């Protein structure tokens, strides 16, 4: 609407994003190289000591791409929007210039953003695996402008003993996964090896998935039960258990 | 044809008026008519080439508005409409180029690429916008069946013949009456020859008629007529009518008696000027008739006398002339000129590239041959392809 | 540059648009570009200079806005619209005279007034709109190098020479072989003379060639190729080389045999027209070889058996010819022809005032000199002098 | 072509930098632009290679970006960004050398290749970074129209000529005066002869002359001038000026006198050099005249006396002779010379893959032809291909 | 002659890497540098000399600053530096002749010219970057 161009009519399923089409379809420079950020911010993939990590864009890290962000929305603000009414034309160009005035606090707030996350992804032991999950957590886009309109300047950054908390939480986790892993897999084979036909697995997996702590085992589905049975199956065994069980 | 004009006609406005720190109020209706064109032209696919060595191109339209609020137009704007209006100048110029070899007999008019019959369907016709130029407005009129007319700043009328006739003539070539000529262009010398300087001629007079059969009619025509021919006064050793030998000509020129020049149209007198020199005006004509004659001079001077004696041999031969140059004129057909470029650039973007000799031109668009067999498909081809150079000539 | 000729299209369109009861709807666009002109000048001293006899111009811009409130331009809109345009149009005519008197060895293609220095900053970028005369749409391509062209009818590109090679020769030049050529303008007539017709070469041919190396590439060229060369067809009493003495021509003219014109670029046949006369097309060229023959009649008359003895002395001398006319012609640099008066109004202004002579071009702006030595710098501060005359040529 | 010369910086900068254990700020800027080349490149599609035998290859990006945020590159890293380096060099090279062995006569300058075509889009301009190589510089500011040149270490600018000129000669060959040159890269060897030893000259001094003409203008030239022609200073059996004979040279070397040297430029003096030997500066110019002369030594020892007799036969020949080197130079157009290695780059791609020959280079690249004939066309075209073999070799 | 080479390597560095499409991380620490010399030049006044038919000429430095807040480099950024630069060059390169043509008997290593002379002050040093020729 802002710059008169035809609304688009988005196709559910296209390979390509609305922005991806904008960006395309837009000439104007500010808006269309902040599109194509937008476009292109993906995480990045990059293991550090063994643990792989998703990293943000440089930019977005120093916060400058935020100026591109102000420089596209400052575009907004001087567009005529045609054929729209020209209260709600100002409405709308008034809140694009609250978001733009607020640069200084947003460049802050990226910044803050990408350091504690950076700060606080040190502290991860097991590989950030991207996977769309089943279920999402909902983010109000009022939230959102309450973060950009109401950040100040008063760093916040964790503590040295939240990092250790987290660290050693997230340590104790994944050992507790390995040992766990590693008790089921004993058994297993141990069970296989001894030739003991009658046992079921599914109460070892069962068990194992209890002693991780984080599953209610009343709603894994079954299919995933048996899969991980099979997976467990073809692991092998520690050389500790292994060595006591021979 | 008008939406190709139309394409070539808004980029060449986006190219001359699109420029760093004009006003946008200078641009808006332009802007207006750009973005029209790249909202008709986006998600088609077009192909030119494939004829001589013409390249196959492949041209592929995916390209945003200009949308951007300003004052004045600035560097940015001004790249982005350059990006576009590249990519659309080179999809036109190859369109010009693959029209402008083509030709067809049946229907010489219409589009012949593809690319240009699928620029004639109904969704580019909002592409179209003003027609001002001559051969697009001459197309549009005729499209409409008005009068269009081409001015020619000294049209090519004439097909090049350098040729002679002999009235009187025998084996030595000694005692000769006749005419030659050169018919070339716009110009017409003309010139008529007596050995005898009409010693027995009735009355002491030759009369020497010379017809030019205009293969188009012309209309509004300025004509500078002088009395002598100055590419027959000199002497000249020509050849035989067929060839056999060669025969001299030694002239002498003595002023043209009672020149008539009529400008006939079906026959009919339109125009007539007797006696007269200098600038005329024949306004309507399709053939030229130029009648003048040998009047041996009844008083002459020793020295003149010695030049014509009663019998032979004759050493000096009397010889009357004219000169007709067209200047201007205006033609319904196109033709062409000596101020214009058109048939330079279809020659040109033929013999570039190759391009095989076709069923409707003669070879190498040789423009003696084209106007000598002027045929009516021929001229529709021929129209075709000009008003296509004309519009390749706006970008290219 | 373009700012100039921005001022000067604006000033046209304002002489033109701005008249008595015109509505307001036909000038509102003009109308604001000539306001934006008006804000962007006003607060701006600038002066043209005293180079030569030109005064020394003092120039000052404090003018008012013109009105937005009539439905329909009056006679006082006009009135005081004309007082503004008239200052504006002084201002410009004395600029563009102040710019085409000056030249420049380094870098010609620059500003060299002052005036026209100040209006190259930034803050003027504003005045600039519509750049769609040919001059200035050569400026801006060959300002981001693209393909120039600028249009000749009659491209004045042959430096004047009428001179002549003596390939056999002797103290009493009674049995001579060789060529005599005018070049002028867009002319070339070339004649091969032999006084003993042949009648020793080895097939009773004699081969003339005639060599015109253009100092510029012309492209799109419209030819016209005649057989005889009308210059060099009358007796003539010419100067040896040396001055020393004079020889006798007295030509008789034969029809060339084997014509074969070539039209060379970079040394490699472009174009090949074998005994082809009439309209021919150039497409892309630097050079011209004329190649002709004088063939000895195999079978002569009496007559003509009579004019070429075996032996000397020989009174008549077997002469062929050819012309060659360049109707109209492209070329990427800037050129005198005979439609435009870039050429005349530059040389007039230059003589006006009295500019004394400068490092670049003749000491008369003569063209024969211009175009002899046509160097990079001589086309580059040429073609500033041109785009500027063409600018004031708007207005004056 | 910045867009090209882009991509190859790049991808040199990633092969240099982003080596095992770098500290991540070393390469936090090359990082980010490497990730723009992914971004700007993954979804594309590119063709090259359908001209003589380079096989047409088809090209795909979907590749992945490299990680920003840890404190050291290590060996993963390096092996994450390398098989996209191998991938993103081999299209370089593929589209460099598809670019490398097209031309065209109209636009020389622009882009002939698919590839590059499709990356002189407005998209692929993200990729643009810094262009700090020679040729990428003379590239932007030519395409700005600014003074700029590149430098040449023995620019090879003269085209390959060994020729003589004899101003006295005869039948026999045994008295002859005249001067015998090379003309080789940036080497002139010139010797002026005379076999009488000037003994009828007036005062005894002969005197010869040398001008080299050329193609383009040569600035800040370092020259070197000794005083002997090495070349032509021992016996030679020449053929004649048609080769219908040989004739015998037997030099014997005086010490040339009244050495001058001008460098001129436009016909005007820039520089003069009178018995000037060693190391020399030619500022701007176009053209080398070389005025030198044989004195005949007034008193000679008897062996001398003997050399040269009185009156012939005359069995020692007197010579003279001048070396001149440029040993560098600053011109605005390209240039082979004995450092860079563009034109040997070009000539070994477009002979490997059996390039046909165009319309604008001669055959084989063979640069005595095409510094011979170095016209505007060729020069766009050489720039073009010659900048092109810059961008590959910073990778290949 | 070190402000004077930092004043050359900066403006060289802009023509070279201020170019349109680029990301502004590949000109980050160009332009600060640019900015600097900027601001140093800013409010002076420079002459450079008559000496033989070199003519004299006048400058003066009241520029703005190259903006930052760009992600990619667009055509607006590039005309304003190419402005800022064509006029620098243009300084530089006339500083530089006036120089090459003066000479002394001693402390002939030592700035000849005015314009050299006035740039060997304190005041430019914060011109000075990277001298790697
Ligand atoms: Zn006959
Ligand atoms: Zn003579
Ligand atoms: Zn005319
Ligand atoms: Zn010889």
């Known amino acids: 609407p802002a710059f008169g161009m035809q609304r688009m009519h988005y196709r559910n399923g296209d390979p390509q994003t609305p922005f991806q089409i904008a960006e395309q379809q837009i000439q104007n420079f500010q808006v269309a190289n902040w599109l194509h950020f937008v476009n292109n911010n993906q995480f990045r993939q990059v293991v550090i000591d063994g643990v792989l990590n998703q990293v943000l864009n440089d930019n977005i890290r120093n916060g400058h791409v935020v100026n591109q962000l102000m420089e596209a929305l400052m575009q907004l603000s001087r567009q005529q929007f045609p054929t729209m009414p020209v209260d709600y034309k100002r409405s709308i160009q008034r809140g694009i210039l609250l978001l733009s005035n607020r640069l200084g606090q947003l460049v802050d707030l990226t910044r803050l953003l990408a350091y504690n996350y950076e700060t606080l992804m040190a502290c991860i032991t097991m590989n950030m695996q991207h996977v769309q999950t089943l279920t999402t957590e909902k983010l109000q886009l009022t939230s959102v402008t309450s973060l950009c309109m109401l950040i100040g300047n008063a760093t916040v950054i964790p503590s040295p003993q939240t990092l250790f908390h987290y660290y050693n939480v997230n340590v104790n986790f994944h050992s507790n996964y390995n040992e766990r892993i590693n008790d089921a897999v004993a058994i297993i084979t141990a069970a296989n090896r001894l030739n003991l036909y009658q046992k079921k697995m599914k109460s070892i997996v069962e068990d194992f998935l209890k002693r991780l702590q984080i599953f209610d085992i009343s709603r894994v589905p079954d299919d995933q039960m048996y899969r991980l049975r099979d997976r467990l199956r073809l692991l092998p065994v520690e050389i500790r258990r292994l060595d006591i069980f021979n | ?207 020497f008629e010379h017809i030019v059969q205009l293969r188009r009619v012309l209309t509004t025509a300025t004509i500078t007529l002088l009395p002598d021919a100055e590419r027959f006064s000199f002497p000249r050793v020509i050849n035989s009518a067929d060839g056999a030998t060669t025969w001299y000509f030694n002239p002498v020129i003595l002023r043209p008696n009672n020149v008539e020049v009529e400008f006939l149209l079906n026959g009919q007198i339109i125009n007539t000027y007797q006696a007269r020199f200098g600038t005329i005006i024949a306004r309507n004509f399709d053939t030229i008739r130029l009648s003048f004659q040998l009047m041996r001079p009844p008083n002459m001077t020793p020295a003149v006398a010695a030049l014509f004696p009663n019998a032979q041999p004759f050493e000096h031969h009397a010889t009357v002339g004219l000169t007709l140059r067209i200047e201007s004129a205006v033609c319904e057909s196109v033709l062409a000129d000596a101020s214009k470029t058109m048939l330079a650039n279809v020659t040109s973007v033929r013999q570039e590239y190759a391009i095989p000799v076709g069923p409707v031109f003669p070879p190498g668009m040789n423009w003696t041959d084209l106007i000598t067999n002027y045929s009516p498909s021929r001229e529709d081809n021929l129209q075709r392809v000009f008003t296509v150079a004309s519009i390749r000539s706006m970008l290219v």
């Open chain 2, 1 to 207: 044809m008008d939406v190709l004009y139309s394409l070539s006609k808004t980029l060449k406005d986006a190219r001359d008026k699109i420029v760093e720190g004009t006003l946008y109020s200078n641009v808006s209706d332009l802007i207006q008519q750009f973005n029209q064109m790249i909202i008709t032209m986006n998600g088609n696919e077009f192909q030119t080439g494939g004829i001589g060595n013409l390249p196959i191109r492949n041209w592929n339209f995916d390209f945003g508005l200009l949308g951007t609020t300003l004052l004045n137009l600035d560097a940015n704007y001004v790249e982005t409409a350059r990006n576009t209006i590249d990519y659309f100048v080179d999809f036109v110029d190859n369109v010009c180029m693959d029209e402008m070899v083509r030709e067809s007999q049946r229907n010489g008019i219409a589009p012949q690429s593809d690319s240009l019959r699928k620029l004639s369907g109904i969704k580019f016709k909002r592409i179209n916008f003003d027609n001002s130029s001559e051969y697009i407005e001459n197309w549009n009129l005729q499209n409409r069946r008005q009068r269009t007319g081409f001015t020619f700043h000294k049209p090519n009328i004439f097909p090049y013949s350098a040729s002679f006739t002999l009235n009187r003539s025998q084996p030595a070539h000694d005692n000769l009456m006749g005419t030659m000529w050169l018919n070339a262009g716009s110009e017409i010398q003309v010139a008529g020859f007596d050995y005898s300087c009409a010693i027995n001629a009735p009355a002491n007079i030759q009369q």
